[PDB]
Amino acid sequence: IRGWIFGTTLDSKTQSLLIVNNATNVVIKVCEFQFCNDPFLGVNCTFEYVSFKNLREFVFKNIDGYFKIYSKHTPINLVRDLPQGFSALEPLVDLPIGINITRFQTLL
Amino acid sequence: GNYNYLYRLFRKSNLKPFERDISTEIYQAGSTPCNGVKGFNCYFPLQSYG
Ligand SMILES: *[C@@H]1O[C@H](CO)[C@@H](O)[C@H](O)[C@H]1NC(C)=O
CB B23 within 8 A of CB B39: no
Q: Which residues contact B42 (CB under 8 A, 6 or more apart)?
A: B26, B27, B28, B29, B30, B32, B34
Q: Which residues contact A105 (CB under 8 A, 6 or more apart)?
A: A4, A5, A10
Q: Which atom of ligand 1 is nearest to the CA of B19?
A: 13
Helical ranges in A37-90 per DSSP H? none
Return d(Cα B47, Cα B50) in angstroms, integer. Answer: 9
Structural resolution in Å? 3.0
* Smallest Cα distance from A44 to chain B, Å: 10
CB B28 within 8 A of CB B36: no
Q: Which residues pair with A107 in a beta bridge?
A: A3
Q: Would an 8 Å CB–CB cutoff place B20 in contact with chain A? A: yes
CB A59 within 8 A of CB A68: yes
The closest alpha carbon to A64, from A103, A90, A97, belongs to A97
CB A1 within 8 A of CB A12: no
Task: Count other Cβ atoms within 10 Å, centred on residue B26.
Answer: 16
Q: How was this structure determined?
A: cryo-EM
